[PDB]
Amino acid sequence: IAIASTKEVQWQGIFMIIVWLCVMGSLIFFANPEASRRVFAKFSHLQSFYGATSVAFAFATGLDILAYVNAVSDEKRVLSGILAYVDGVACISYLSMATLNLYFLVDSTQGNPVWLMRYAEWIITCPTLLYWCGLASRADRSSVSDIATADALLLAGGALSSILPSWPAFFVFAGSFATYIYVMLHMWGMFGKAMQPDFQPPPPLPRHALHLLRCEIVMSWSIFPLVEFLRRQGYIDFQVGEAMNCVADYAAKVGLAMIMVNCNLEQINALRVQQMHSALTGMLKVMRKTNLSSSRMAQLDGVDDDVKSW
Amino acid sequence: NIAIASTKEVQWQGIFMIIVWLCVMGSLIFFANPEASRRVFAKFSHLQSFYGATSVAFAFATGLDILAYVNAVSDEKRVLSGILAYVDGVACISYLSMATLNLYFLVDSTQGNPVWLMRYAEWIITCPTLLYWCGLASRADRSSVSDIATADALLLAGGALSSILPSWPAFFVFAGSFATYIYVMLHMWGMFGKAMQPDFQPPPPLPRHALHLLRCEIVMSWSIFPLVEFLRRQGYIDFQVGEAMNCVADYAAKVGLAMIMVNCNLEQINALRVQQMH
Ligand SMILES: CCCCCCCC/C=C\CCCCCCCC(=O)OC[C@H](O)CO
Ligand SMILES: CCCCCCCC/C=C\CCCCCCCC(=O)OC[C@H](O)CO
Ligand SMILES: CCCCCCCC/C=C\CCCCCCCC(=O)OC[C@H](O)CO
Ligand SMILES: *C/C=C(C)/C=C/C=C(C)/C=C/C1=C(C)CCCC1(C)C
Ligand SMILES: *C/C=C(C)/C=C/C=C(C)/C=C/C1=C(C)CCCC1(C)C
């Protein structure tokens, strides 16, 4: 329920990039390039997996900068503003993940890397996307910062659960998953309470589209805990798990933009509903000013119009 | 006379693009050599990953045009995104098949690299359609379009046949195809020009500004392929480098069109509710 202006979405956007331009430098300071080259060789397709995701996110932002300029309203404008920066961070993250010497941690389950840059992306992105849901539905400013902060610590636990021994990993990882359902349960009830046809303040998106948001987010964010579960269990390869993470990272953020584009293209029907009513009352005003009986000015006035409808 | 389309006509034109490609996919699985394809994806490990990534990029790019079709401003700006909804879908199933199927290919005489006929069979189905599609954004002669459409169809074929020829003739058949490429592009730049006139007889379904963008998007995005194969056959870049460029250039040329229809449809609604405020 922030109801922020375009200059606020710029101020939050420059904060995300400077709080990122600090994160990358932090992860470049602790770099061990001998092992980064060793990991980017033992797992060959990684530099291609992440480099392909960065290019895919480059066009993802271009689709938002078009939706931002050509936005139908100033309400839907500031919504594509947050997605413009959230998807831009996804591109500079995977660009650096695929070309830079970054900091990662050995995990206890299988000895795999923990990219931390991608975790540092989600802790910058995922809280913002829940604040984004706090505007498409206009929930309470507290009920949003609840799940917003609960989802930030959520990602942190699953990151700092890979280092832990067997049992404290299971218990910290299971603690993050329980918090996940909390975020997805409050959201489904956050949009569901905004979809009611009797709801002030009327949401900046149509009522039906909110169901698409609480559907797309639920069944796209669920992939990440499902991959970290299987891969730690040892039931899928590391790269096969990384490939899913890169595509799920794409479908989750891009899925919102295509819904924003869908909404901006749907107000055209709303325009064509207003055009109908205007031309209906316009023909109504003429009937309220004419007299329709035997007033012979062409034929009888009534049959002239009746022949027109015939 | 001129060049027009209709919704049900692009629907049957759409399903013709897929059945002439389904036939193509069968022929290339039929003549394929799986023992030789395994060697390709072995030496070039990133090939299978590139195509599968390109396919994912095109899967979403198709669905964006479906939203432009159901929520189109005009009956003509519908049958324009309709062509792209089939063009961009072929790219999704072409790259999904290139990354997951045993396909037929050829060894080029220049450097022994593979020549992906499935991709060549994609452009032969795409490029002549986008030029029929360019005959609807500008409404050129059905003869002026049939020329470039059949000249671009043989253009991609000549560049494919050039790989199998010896030294001397491959030079001239390749150069003979690039000479026709400029013939296609020169006719396009002047094809939008006739419609870009503020006093044109059949008003084009696009504004004058959006038409100059198209003749710039199609010039600067299509010129990459004749530069990739050039710098790859000469040996100035690795094969996988030219494939990654071909995997990105193939996305820009077709999503560049998809984002023009979005911005024009969006520019139309914002202009229309303004004309309602007044
Ligand atoms: C253990 C993983 C370590 C990774 C290594 C890099 C860490 C840097 C990442 C984030 C910095 C914190 C800045 C963002 C903090 C967001 C907290 C939050 O939830 O804010 C929501 C907001 O209240 C909605 O209105
Ligand atoms: C009716 C438009 C159909 C366009 C193609 C869709 C099917 C593409 C499949 C194979 C193309 C093989 C090469 C075909 C060469 C183009 C044929 C042509 O000249 O069409 C011009 C049309 O008359 C201008 O209105
Ligand atoms: C000026 C154009 C006026 C309007 C006409 C529109 C049509 C343009 C179409 C093709 C032009 C040539 C395509 C680009 C070919 C460049 C090849 C080249 O210059 O090669 C340099 C060399 O490869 C370095 O490494
Ligand atoms: C754009 C990136 C997004 C939306 C990432 C979302 C991640 C989640 C919704 C959940 C992640 C995890 C858990 C629920 C538990 C284990 C740790 C994670 C990060 C895999
Ligand atoms: C969607 C796919 C498109 C737009 C493909 C376009 C291909 C070209 C514009 C050109 C291709 C070639 C040449 C000009 C010369 C050598 C042969 C080709 C196919 C590389």
Author numbering:
A (entry chain B): 44 to 353
B (entry chain A): 43 to 320
Q: What did the study's authors say about this model?
A:
Rh-PDE derived from Salpingoeca rosetta (SrRh-PDE) was first identified and exhibits light-dependent hydrolytic activity for both of cAMP and cGMP, whereas it lacks pump or channel activity. SrRh-PDE consists of the long N-terminal region, transmembrane domain (TMD), including the rhodopsin domain, C-terminal PDE domain, and 76-residue linker region connecting the TMD and PDE domain.
To obtain structural insight into the full-length Rh-PDE, we determined the 3.5 Å resolution crystal structure of Rh-PDE–TMD with the linker region (TMD–Linker, residues 33–378). The TMD–Linker structure superimposes well on the TMD structure (RMSD value of 0.84 Å over all Cα atoms). While the crystal packing is different between the TMD and TMD–Linker structures, both form a similar dimer interface. In one protomer, the C-terminal residues are observed up to Trp353. Residues 311 to 332 adopts a straight α-helix continuous from TM7, while residues 333–353 adopt a short loop and α-helix, turning back to the TMD. In the dimer, the α-helices in the linker regions cross each other, suggesting that the PDE dimer is swapped between the TMD dimer. Although the crystal packing might affect the conformation of the linker region, we can interpret its structure and connectivity with the TMD. In this model, TM7 is connected to the PDE domain via the linker regions crossing each other, resulting in the swapped position between the TMD and PDE domain.
